[PDB]
Amino acid sequence: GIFGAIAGFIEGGWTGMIDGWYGYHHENSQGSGYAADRESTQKAIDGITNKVNSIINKMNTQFEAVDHEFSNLERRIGNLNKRMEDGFLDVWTYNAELLVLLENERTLDLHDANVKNLYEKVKSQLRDNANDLGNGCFEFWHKCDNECMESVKNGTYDYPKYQKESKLNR
Amino acid sequence: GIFGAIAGFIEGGWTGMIDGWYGYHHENSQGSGYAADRESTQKAIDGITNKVNSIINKMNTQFEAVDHEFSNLERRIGNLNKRMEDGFLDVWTYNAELLVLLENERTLDLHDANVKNLYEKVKSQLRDNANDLGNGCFEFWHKCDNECMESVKNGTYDYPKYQKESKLNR
Amino acid sequence: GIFGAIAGFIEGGWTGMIDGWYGYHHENSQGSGYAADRESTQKAIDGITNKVNSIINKMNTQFEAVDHEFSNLERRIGNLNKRMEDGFLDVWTYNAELLVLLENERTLDLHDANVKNLYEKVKSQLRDNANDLGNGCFEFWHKCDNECMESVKNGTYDYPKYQKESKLNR
Amino acid sequence: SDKICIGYHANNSTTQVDTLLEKNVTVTHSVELLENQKEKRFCKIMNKAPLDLKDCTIEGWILGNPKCDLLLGDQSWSYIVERPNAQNGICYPGVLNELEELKAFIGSGERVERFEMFPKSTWAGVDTSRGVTNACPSYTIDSSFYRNLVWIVKTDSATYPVIKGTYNNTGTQPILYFWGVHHPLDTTVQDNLYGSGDKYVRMGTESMNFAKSPEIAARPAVNGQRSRIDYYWSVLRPGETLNVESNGNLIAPWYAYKFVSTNKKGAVFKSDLPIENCDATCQTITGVLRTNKTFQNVSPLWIGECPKYVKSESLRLATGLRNVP
Amino acid sequence: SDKICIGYHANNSTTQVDTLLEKNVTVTHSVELLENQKEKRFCKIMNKAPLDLKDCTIEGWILGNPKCDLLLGDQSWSYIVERPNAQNGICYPGVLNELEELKAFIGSGERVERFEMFPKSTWAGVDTSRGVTNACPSYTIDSSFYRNLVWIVKTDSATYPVIKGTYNNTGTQPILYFWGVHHPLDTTVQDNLYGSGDKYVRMGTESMNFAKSPEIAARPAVNGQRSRIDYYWSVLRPGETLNVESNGNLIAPWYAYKFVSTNKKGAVFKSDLPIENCDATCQTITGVLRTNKTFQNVSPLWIGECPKYVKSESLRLATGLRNVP
Amino acid sequence: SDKICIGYHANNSTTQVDTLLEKNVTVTHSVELLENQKEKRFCKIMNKAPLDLKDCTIEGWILGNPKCDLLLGDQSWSYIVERPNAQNGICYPGVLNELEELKAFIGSGERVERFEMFPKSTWAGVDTSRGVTNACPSYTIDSSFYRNLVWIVKTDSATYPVIKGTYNNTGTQPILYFWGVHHPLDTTVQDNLYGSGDKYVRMGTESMNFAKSPEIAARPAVNGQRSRIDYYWSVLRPGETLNVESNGNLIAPWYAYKFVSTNKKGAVFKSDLPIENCDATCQTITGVLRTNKTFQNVSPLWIGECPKYVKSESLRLATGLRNVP
Ligand SMILES: CC(=O)N[C@@H]1[C@@H](OC2O[C@H](CO)[C@H](O)[C@H](O)[C@H]2O)[C@H](O)[C@@H](CO)O[C@H]1O
Ligand SMILES: *[C@@H]1O[C@H](CO)[C@@H](O)[C@H](O)[C@H]1NC(C)=O
Ligand SMILES: *[C@@H]1O[C@H](CO)[C@@H](O)[C@H](O)[C@H]1NC(C)=O
Ligand SMILES: *[C@@H]1O[C@H](CO)[C@@H](O)[C@H](O)[C@H]1NC(C)=O
Ligand SMILES: *[C@@H]1O[C@H](CO)[C@@H](O)[C@H](O)[C@H]1NC(C)=O
Ligand SMILES: *[C@@H]1O[C@H](CO)[C@@H](O)[C@H](O)[C@H]1NC(C)=O
Ligand SMILES: *[C@@H]1O[C@H](CO)[C@@H](O)[C@H](O)[C@H]1NC(C)=O
Ligand SMILES: *[C@@H]1O[C@H](CO)[C@@H](O)[C@H](O)[C@H]1NC(C)=O
Ligand SMILES: *[C@@H]1O[C@H](CO)[C@@H](O)[C@H](O)[C@H]1NC(C)=O
Ligand SMILES: *[C@@H]1O[C@H](CO)[C@@H](O)[C@H](O)[C@H]1NC(C)=O
């Protein structure tokens, strides 16, 4: 990726996160697991689906080649027809083949960005109440139960509460 | 946005910032207000204008269909002409419709990036003399009057002054 | 660039870094110099080369215009031929000219991103064992000899080891 | 210590895509936009069966070659299938003038109704019943003639008089019809069949005229004939009238077709492929496609609603992300 | 505590654009690239008025149908407007040979000057002063003839002699000219008009020759005529000379046109629309566009400098950002 | 204090590229995709030399104009170079029928072998040994005739009898051949050369027939001739036989060409440029390109393997980054 996250300062993905494209893995005293971020996953499913359908929709016309015959005194128009029919075939073949190449590049970047932005959102809340650890993982300088985990995921963390334990554990 | 800022870790725009595309909102003892960043707005206007004019310029040729008639013994070339004329019409209709779709995607990303880069510039001056907050706002660890506000915007902040005041407070 | 680094919160490049596209400039007691990051440079050379070769490959067909003559009673098909031949010339000229315009925009962005990501990698290892000056430079809060320099470049820095030394000095 | 980590999906996919930057990139999800499968057969389109000309060409069918009787009468068709080795076409050697424009006009239609345009009694003072030839047999009679034309010759007794005929197309449909001019190999046969004297065939309509004269000459033998016929065709439009006038050498129109034009585009497929009792919405010269895909690499020639033809082997668009399990 | 925030513009815009990722995205600023407005009329182009053929077709105009006198003489035009119900064309039934190639040649021009190419005295020993027909009347004389042709008949007394004429094109401009051959319905009329004997019309030039013989036959009545005329046209190039030779059945050239070709491309619009005193730089078959936009969905047919025709309803490009007020 | 800095490459490049966002951007590395250099000459293609028609046109070459003897016999070619001011074409005034289609058929070939198709003795009871004209001289004899045709006239003594000839193409190659029909200026010359009576030329094949009659008339003088010849050409396919029959006015086939078609596409270049002893893989009408680039703005007309033609002056793709030294 160009945003640097997927394969990656976050090397590798998660076969265990079954319900989304991007999300979270946590571990604390009550246990551990995987959980998708629904909002960003869904918003990406809608975008990519729209991209596919827009491409399908814009490509939805056809050049129609034709079976007409030509006499031995119509070599010139016969060949005009052939040169024309191959001409449009070459134009459309190019358009499709290049579009796919370009769009696949830009689709990987989009996913890469969405992962990066998720990571950055978490980073802004936590600040120095956690230690980065460089693989897209954060070690809390404090006790973070499930309610505190959901806190981080829904965007309502509360740095002031925890700044306490966090500083002295630091 | 792909850069994460517009709608957004900065949810919502500002109807009250009338004079630019990107800029600043401040609040202090003397009051509050809005002010565009002229350098980045202008540099985006130049880029988008160039993009529009480059598209206009490359699209500035025409396939010219023709009113010629064909006899009841010229069904084959009559139809060659029709198939050709519709062929180029379909090619150009595709090129235009897809270009607009693609370029509008990329234009929103550009605005998104410029907002994010403004945020990053301010972040670099302020450092730990302010607290990030995550919504594109910075809370000063110190008294920042209007002259100090203009300071931030014109790129001449002066971390060393402030610093002592900021550390006690943080 | 859109990522904000090249010309730039890092204004200016380095004529003295001869062996790569992106890399490092260091200074310490043993001396100073310039050194490319091979991994990221190479990975960009492979990507750009692939891009160039893909464009070459997809453009590897030709519309073939033809020298056939037409009588004074074949003004209509003569002109059908001309209109067709110019038609494809206008389509291919557009495709090539726009592609170049678009791809050059996106190639600069790629370089810009790779410089930004390099900068961010170094920033994550160093943390508060160094101070951000501005042009993408870091001043160490500690003595960093060549082995420590290589340490930063190869991604193995060891924050714990210079943390006590770095905290005094601040 | 408690961790929270940010990350992304992986799965067991081994499907790959290309990008401008990188080839063979494995992704979690993708969609293929191109179809490369076909059923190798011809099916009905819009519930209408195609017309199998079997061992006849378009020429043989439409002129009424006596070995093309199974096709005789009314026909309706979604498209036409001409078998590439069909043997029964022009039995009596000669050229069908504007053949390519005829093959195109026929292809633009969807039905014909055969009817007697000029009965044999139209032609006064001539023999309409011995106009027959071994170049041109049935399966039973080895000397016959096209079922839509009459080879008129003079009576033993007499002179070949001036003969006339008129047909007013008072219907709503245009009529496709046919005639010819006989070109004997030498003077003796000219005199036998038509008598001596400068001969002509003239025809006319509110919008066309025609006039030809016999060109007597021995040409190379084809199905035993060193004579020839020049065949001609035309379309009498609704409201138009046809006048025929000749004093010799006329191969006269007898039966013709009320022709009904397709608002669509039509097709003529030259193919070996079988015709089966199946329905389809897209039929290519090399087979039917049943697909929802927007591209195909089977054939540029078709009828119905097909996908855009391209030369690609594959057009796979990434939807998911890079798969790193 | 004092706050400085970073942010972006919003406004009261409700204008939307589409992207690959998302439809109906409201943006702060945008530009529409496609024109869909037209004025439904024909205007001058390059200050030159178009030529309104009114109740005449191109054929009627250029042959000199007597009801097309208001068009007679010199004309200059930016383009041609032929009204789809025009009544006055070929008055005396027959075919104008290579009609489509004539309609195309005329369209490629910008002026004609009418002049007497062969005066009536050119033709010795014949009557040039009858040659008139009720199929082909003025508004005042109900038996007349094309103003650019002479129907030559023999004098009461005599035989139709061999007649000859020559014209050397010593000008700088090519000449568009016309002739015909009469095909009477029967022998009696042939003998009345031209006498008995094999008849011919021959014409020639350094680069063309022509030879036709009358084809006598009754064809269906059109404006009371069962005879026909085959009309012909050609272009005598600068420096070329024309020789005419006939002993009967010639409809002779009388007046012709010095023709001046456009370096541009020209147009022939078949339309009902009014012609008004207005200027324009872009004229489509369905109206004028006055626009700076680079696309349009009005018509693919035009003259002047128009925008590229596409099938879109709209082509709106985002300039500002997503609007979130 | 110790620094470590992150940064990017710069160099002494002054080369620029354009982007949608910005014009004239200096970059460290770039690649030009468009070729604008050519060698202004014609070279061999696939080791085969082109054919230089020098002071002859295609017509003159292929009819055997006596001033085109240096081209006479067998030829092999990669392409054909016709010089734009070539003087020696049709010497005896007339039209070569279907000229553009002949120029196209010839261009699709790669070799011809010249051979006697009908020896003069083929034609019984006529004079084959005059048939010569001052309109049509060698460099030495100022009264001659096309080397591939015979102008037959009757003997002083006698009548012009019916003459006949046949040729069975038993070979594997198609044959390109030529004939004509003489059109005298007046009756006296008709009678001199061919005698009185209705005259004809008829020809035929398993798949074509031809019949023409002389059209006597004085046409404008061209190289001293007010008579004309209509020239004709055709292709006798392998297995086919040709029968010729005439009683007057035949310009008979004498020599013809066994023609071998190119599986490739062929070219006919109308150009002044020199032909040199050089090899090439891409030859344009205006010069050879030796390049690896994928675009070019030299010419749309070529043979061999050339790059795609476009109107651009330049197509420079950035590879490195923005250069800020
Ligand atoms: C009687 C006379 O001298 N007539 C000349 C002729 O000059 C020439 O034409 C004759 C054929 O008539 C022949 O071809 C000869 O080679 C040629 O010099 C012409 O007959 C005529 C135009 O062709 O012009 C007369 O002045
Ligand atoms: C791969 O994973 C899917 C879930 O999408 C699973 O149901 C399927 O059985 C697996 N296929 C293989 C080949 O392992
Ligand atoms: C992907 O790359 C592999 C090489 O490992 C190759 O075998 C395969 O054909 C490629 N797939 C496509 C769709 O080109
Ligand atoms: C031509 O080809 C061969 C010659 O051996 C033969 O079978 C055939 O009969 C010949 N035809 C004619 C008309 O001479
Ligand atoms: C938008 O804003 C301006 C007020 O400054 C006004 O002129 C315009 O009418 C407004 N448009 C709408 C739709 O309210
Ligand atoms: C945009 O979407 C709206 C639905 O709110 C629809 O009414 C309108 O037609 C759409 N406009 C375009 C340009 O598609
Ligand atoms: C045409 O006229 C010019 C002289 O003004 C002359 O050169 C030429 O002989 C003439 N051509 C003919 C065929 O009479
Ligand atoms: C043919 O159709 C109708 C008969 O009702 C009539 O208008 C017209 O006279 C007829 N045409 C001719 C040429 O007789
Ligand atoms: C160009 O750069 C090179 C470094 O590769 C340097 O040696 C040379 O002096 C420079 N040229 C000029 C004119 O400064
Ligand atoms: C690039 O811009 C410069 C202006 O600095 C101009 O002189 C030059 O012609 C431009 N080059 C191209 C290829 O347009």
Side-chain angles (χ1 to χ4, degrees), chain D residues 220-221, chain F residues 166 168-170 206 239-241 243:
Chain F
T166 193
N168 192 338
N169 181 5
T170 65
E206 285 85 354
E240 293 198 316
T241 295
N243 294 347

Side-chain angles (χ1 to χ4, degrees), chain C:
Chain C
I2 59 165
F3 279 92
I6 285 168
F9 73 82
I10 306 174
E11 49 183 316
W14 288 331
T15 55
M17 178 194 268
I18 298 151
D19 50 332
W21 270 335
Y22 327 120
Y24 314 91
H25 171 42
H26 74 274
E27 192 172 339
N28 61 11
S29 288
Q30 291 128 292
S32 81
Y34 288 101
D37 187 71
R38 257 176 244 141
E39 199 208 316
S40 69
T41 290
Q42 192 62 55
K43 164 137 173 92
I45 286 167
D46 307 339
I48 299 317
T49 295
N50 199 257
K51 182 196 278 205
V52 173
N53 293 338
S54 296
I55 287 171
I56 284 165
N57 186 270
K58 293 327 174 178
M59 293 290 190
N60 196 20
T61 70
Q62 296 87 42
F63 175 81
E64 277 164 24
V66 94
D67 60 49
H68 293 154
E69 282 170 17
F70 299 96
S71 69
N72 70 338
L73 286 174
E74 292 173 324
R75 171 185 296 276
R76 291 166 306 148
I77 60 163
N79 182 238
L80 199 162
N81 193 59
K82 180 155 234 301
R83 279 153 52 232
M84 183 199 57
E85 289 183 348
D86 296 343
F88 285 112
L89 177 52
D90 287 345
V91 169
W92 288 110
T93 298
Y94 163 87
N95 284 341
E97 288 188 356
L98 192 93
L99 187 64
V100 163
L101 251 26
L102 169 59
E103 289 309 311
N104 288 347
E105 194 194 328
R106 299 174 55 246
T107 296
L108 301 184
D109 283 339
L110 176 97
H111 294 306
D112 197 10
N114 289 162
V115 170
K116 165 92 139 170
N117 296 325
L118 242 194
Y119 161 81
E120 235 115 76
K121 271 184 55 165
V122 169
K123 187 171 202 184
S124 294
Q125 300 193 75
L126 301 193
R127 311 177 182 171
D128 66 352
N129 281 3
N131 187 40
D132 209 304
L133 301 175
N135 231 23
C137 289
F138 293 92
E139 259 207 334
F140 292 88
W141 285 120
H142 76 82
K143 226 79 263 177
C144 189
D145 66 5
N146 285 348
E147 197 193 352
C148 164
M149 290 294 181
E150 293 299 341
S151 180
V152 175
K153 296 178 194 163
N154 73 28
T156 63
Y157 163 71
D158 201 335
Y159 176 82
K161 169 184 197 177
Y162 302 107
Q163 198 202 335
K164 204 211 174 208
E165 188 180 347
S166 291
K167 205 168 76 84
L168 276 134
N169 295 340
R170 263 202 287 123

Side-chain angles (χ1 to χ4, degrees), chain A residues 77-159:
Chain A
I77 59 165
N79 181 238
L80 197 163
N81 193 58
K82 179 155 234 302
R83 280 154 51 236
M84 185 197 58
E85 291 183 349
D86 297 343
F88 285 115
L89 177 51
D90 285 345
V91 167
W92 287 110
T93 296
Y94 162 86
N95 285 339
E97 287 188 355
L98 193 92
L99 187 64
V100 164
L101 252 27
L102 168 59
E103 289 309 310
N104 288 347
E105 194 194 328
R106 298 172 55 248
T107 296
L108 301 184
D109 283 341
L110 174 98
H111 294 304
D112 197 11
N114 289 166
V115 170
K116 164 92 139 172
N117 297 325
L118 247 195
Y119 161 82
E120 234 115 76
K121 270 185 53 167
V122 171
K123 187 172 202 182
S124 293
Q125 300 193 74
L126 299 191
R127 312 176 187 172
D128 63 358
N129 281 1
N131 187 43
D132 200 310
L133 259 177
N135 193 29
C137 287
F138 291 91
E139 259 202 345
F140 294 85
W141 284 118
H142 76 82
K143 227 80 264 175
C144 189
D145 67 3
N146 288 341
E147 303 183 352
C148 164
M149 292 292 181
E150 290 159 8
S151 180
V152 175
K153 298 176 194 164
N154 75 26
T156 63
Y157 161 72
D158 202 334
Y159 177 83

